[PDB]
Design a protein around this motif. Structure first.
Motif, mmCIF file in Angstrom:
data_model
loop_
_atom_site.group_PDB
_atom_site.id
_atom_site.type_symbol
_atom_site.label_atom_id
_atom_site.label_comp_id
_atom_site.label_asym_id
_atom_site.label_seq_id
_atom_site.Cartn_x
_atom_site.Cartn_y
_atom_site.Cartn_z
ATOM 1 N N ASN A 129 0.861 -1.178 0.000
ATOM 2 C CA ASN A 129 0.000 0.000 0.000
ATOM 3 C C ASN A 129 0.898 1.230 0.000
ATOM 4 N N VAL A 144 0.851 4.575 2.330
ATOM 5 C CA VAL A 144 1.366 4.616 3.696
ATOM 6 C C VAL A 144 2.860 4.889 3.577
ATOM 7 N N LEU A 173 -0.311 4.693 11.389
ATOM 8 C CA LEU A 173 -0.822 3.942 10.239
ATOM 9 C C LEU A 173 0.218 2.979 9.674
ATOM 10 N N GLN A 186 -0.172 -0.238 11.756
ATOM 11 C CA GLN A 186 -1.383 -0.945 11.341
ATOM 12 C C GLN A 186 -1.200 -1.645 9.994
ATOM 13 N N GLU A 187 -0.530 -0.982 9.039
ATOM 14 C CA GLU A 187 -0.365 -1.569 7.713
ATOM 15 C C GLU A 187 0.649 -2.711 7.722
HETATM 16 C C1 LIG Z 1 -3.969 1.978 2.167
HETATM 17 O O1 LIG Z 1 -3.795 2.713 3.390
HETATM 18 C C2 LIG Z 1 -4.706 3.812 3.523
HETATM 19 C C3 LIG Z 1 -4.307 4.567 4.769
HETATM 20 O O2 LIG Z 1 -4.427 3.762 5.935
HETATM 21 C C4 LIG Z 1 -6.137 3.284 3.562
HETATM 22 O O3 LIG Z 1 -7.045 4.378 3.636
HETATM 23 C C5 LIG Z 1 -6.426 2.457 2.316
HETATM 24 O O4 LIG Z 1 -7.705 1.845 2.429
HETATM 25 C C6 LIG Z 1 -5.370 1.369 2.129
HETATM 26 N N1 LIG Z 1 -5.596 0.647 0.886
HETATM 27 C C7 LIG Z 1 -5.986 -0.632 0.843
HETATM 28 C C8 LIG Z 1 -6.179 -1.215 -0.524
HETATM 29 O O5 LIG Z 1 -6.172 -1.290 1.864
#
Ligand SMILES: *[C@@H]1O[C@H](CO)[C@@H](O)[C@H](O)[C@H]1NC(C)=O
Ligand SMILES: O=C(O)Cc1ccc(-c2ccccc2)cc1
Length: 340
Positions: free
Chosen positions: A9, A12, A119, A122-123
């Motif tokens: 992603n 982030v 974030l 979390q990611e």
């Molecule tokens: C990528 O991260 C952003 C920020 O947390 C989030 O809003 C978005 O949904 C994420 N994309 C995916 C495909 O999960």
């Protein structure tokens, strides 16, 4: 060696818009996962962040990161260097958000830098669940210095993230090393953190935010105020005379300074009195858990890797295997095992 993975992603990001990431070393025969948060101070406005970008850029950008990193201390896979968790899956999360792991703000037309530490954590968890974390029994979120404070700010959010994703069986725990500070009087003459939070759109744990309320969230960056609000088990490692605490206090010996330093040790010992899992030696130092010689220091005859193993058993008092270890002597290096 732990191998680098940049986040899939790409929204982030580190401070400068480059992708954040993590270094991973898997251990297929283990259900324990160690996620470690790097430290390294912070920046709280445009001018001060520009300075850091000039001479501390690896803490603001992934563009120059190496493809591997050697695991050391608690991130080591050798039993001799790491008696505690040598067989665990190891993750090193680089600190590239300059926000004490609290931010949730993107780079935009109105923001020169991105502050996404909360974030990023979390990611990393989300992408790891597809690499094995879905099978874990224990996730230990650890960190040193600014990463130690980051553990206190984020451990309950990781636990809530996994519950809402349908993984109620993974036990989330925290290990905060050198991140437990006092908002005390300086020796020679909280504002920077207050300005930082607004600059970063910083976020703090929910129960602590509801206690202190709007405008006073800076309080939740101080261990003795945020810890009582947390639900996850957290082990606290903290030198009584932390070098970064003394730096922010303007300390660098006559009666005035002797009394100042002795009172600082006493106050820190007092904040830890009702912390059941803690390791607090009377040393002048900073950080310990990813240092190669982290096995050397002892309190009341017990090493830190042993204390952590005893903590593990307590989460299944134990004879000869203690978990609360705080020095009582009142001067730096009154403990003979202090780092040279
Ligand atoms: C990528 O991260 C952003 C920020 O947390 C989030 O809003 C978005 O949904 C994420 N994309 C995916 C495909 O999960
Ligand atoms: O990162 C370092 O090497 C030292 C360090 C550790 C924690 C904090 C900190 C910032 C905000 C609230 C509490 C602690 C600052 C500096």
């Amino acid at each position: 060696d732990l191998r680098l993975h940049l986040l899939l992603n790409t929204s982030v990001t580190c401070n400068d818009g480059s992708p954040a990431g993590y270094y991973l070393k898997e251990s297929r025969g283990s259900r324990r996962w160690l996620l470690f948060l790097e430290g390294g101070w912070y920046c709280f406005n445009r001018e001060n962040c520009d300075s850091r970008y000039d001479t501390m850029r690896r803490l603001m950008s992934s563009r120059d990161w190496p493809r591997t990193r050697t695991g050391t201390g608690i991130l080591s896979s050798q039993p001799e260097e790491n008696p505690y968790w040598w067989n665990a899956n190891m993750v090193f999360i680089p600190y590239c958000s300059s926000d004490v792991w609290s931010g949730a703000s993107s780079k935009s037309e109105k923001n020169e830098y991105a502050f996404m530490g909360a974030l990023i954590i979390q990611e990393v968890v989300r992408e790891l669940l597809g690499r094995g974390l879905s099978g874990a029994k224990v996730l230990l979120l650890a960190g040193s210095s600014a990463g130690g404070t980051g553990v206190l700010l984020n451990v309950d959010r990781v636990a809530e993230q996994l519950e809402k994703l349908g993984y109620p069986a993974i036990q989330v725990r925290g290990l905060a090393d050198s991140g437990w500070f006092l908002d005390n009087k300086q020796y020679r003459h909280t504002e920077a953190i207050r300005r930082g939070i607004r600059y970063w759109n910083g976020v703090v744990p929910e129960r602590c935010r509801r206690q202190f309320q709007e405008g006073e969230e800076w309080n939740c960056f101080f261990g003795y105020k945020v810890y009582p609000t947390l639900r996850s088990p957290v082990f606290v490692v903290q030198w009584l005379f932390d070098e970064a605490q003394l730096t922010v206090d303007n300390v660098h010996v006559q009666e005035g300074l002797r009394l100042y330093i002795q009172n600082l040790g006493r106050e820190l010992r007092h904040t830890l009195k009702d912390v059941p899992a803690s390791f607090a030696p009377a040393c002048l130092s900073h950080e310990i858990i990813i240092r190669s010689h982290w096995t050397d220091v002892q309190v009341k005859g017990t090493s830190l890797p042993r204390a952590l193993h005893c903590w593990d058993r307590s989460l299944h008092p134990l004879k000869g295997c203690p978990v609360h270890l705080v020095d009582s002597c009142p001067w730096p290096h009154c403990n003979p095992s202090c780092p040279t």
